[model samples]
Target: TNAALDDKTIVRDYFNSTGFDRWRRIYGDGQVNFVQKDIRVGHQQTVDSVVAWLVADGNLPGLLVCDAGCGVGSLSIPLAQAGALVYGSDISEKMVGEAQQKAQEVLAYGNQPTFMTQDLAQLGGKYDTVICLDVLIHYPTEEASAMISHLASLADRRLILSFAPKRAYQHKEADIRKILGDNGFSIARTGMTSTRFYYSRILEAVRS
Candidate 1:
């Protein structure tokens, strides 16, 4: 659909319907095409790396985390299982529903994340760590800046996020740094995921 619809509308509608089904296969154990597998591997690497970092540095047992754009509980479930108090949210109702279902089925411990349907820029509450992975591609720089500010505001200690490094539908490093620095966050650690179809730069920013 090359129509001139707004990015939020386009992303919301697609993810609520077609994107929901398509992503389930990639995120789940279901077999997918080679390209989809590449994306799955890449994304899981990002998730695992984030979790490993948290476990090592953030003390998951009691940390408060916000998993913004938590699709189907991929990261939230693991974080909850790790004993973190997690709040998972997504713009797509379908995605949130699926995440809730998956959390119920998979979370052996009682540490379940509270899931909600929400846009990235309107989430509430203060958290020890805030993560917004794979969500920035849906907005341009202006909206992304607002989202970064809002997420950063919700974070009391850490603001971990990912962005597609591209000319189309992504942000530059300079702009990301400027916003985070202006908001009193300093970059602590950074990494990149580059598996065939999936490419993202992940950064960890701590309150300064």
Candidate 2:
């Protein structure tokens, strides 16, 4: 099978094309089954887990949040509804457009999330929390490490990232904790979840 060679082009083409359709099913509220169900349920679990963590102390209102690589506003919208001011960014223009629309559709009274087309390296501004879910699958180890550092810089309180482990055999959890430690961040907690076909780990860190 032929695919785009570079990360940007591959992401753009995917979200502008078939990946958008597949993700809509994964991210949408409608029902899905089989492999799609695994994708949908697993992703929602990540979102729910993060949201629960954020609101655990009952202090979600008015917190500034950055949803990097937000796809169709799935996580961002809920955060906004929880009264956080969210800046949601995605690499795909089409995805950003859809996310913007979804934000408008779902957000009732809280600060509406601003959606923009941006690569992770291009993300800016300060936030109480920065969340990037299911986005690092595109990056190799070195690149992902740098991205984590940049994200940590933008967040004042917390940085939450979820990724499919790049190298499963090499003590992935320890390696990831080391990456966070090297970047002046400390892993506060970690959650792992799996579907029939995919597994992801969410690492919540705080600046050290």
TM-score of each: 0.94, 0.90
Model 1 compared with the native: what TM-score?
A: 0.94
The local distance difference test score of model 2 is 0.82
Give one digit per residue, the lDDT tens place, for model 2 in 1-208. 5553666677678888988888877788677677888888888888999998998858789888899999899899888888888889988888888888887777754578988888878777788889998887766666777888898889898899988875122125666778888877888878987888667899999987
Per residue, candidate 1 scores C-alpha lDDT tens digits across 1-208 of 7658777778989988988999987998887999999999999999999999999875889899999999898999999998999999999999999999999888745889999998877788899999999888878888899899999999999999998885248789889988999899999999899988999899999998
* Cα shift from native, residue 89, model 1 (Å): 0.5
For model 2, the stretches where C-alpha displacement exceeds 4 angstroms are 1-5, 30-33, 108-110, 166-171
Q: What's the lDDT for residue 104 in model 1?
A: 86
Instruction: List lDDT for all candidates, in order.
Output: 0.90, 0.82
Q: Which model scores highest in TM-score? A: 1
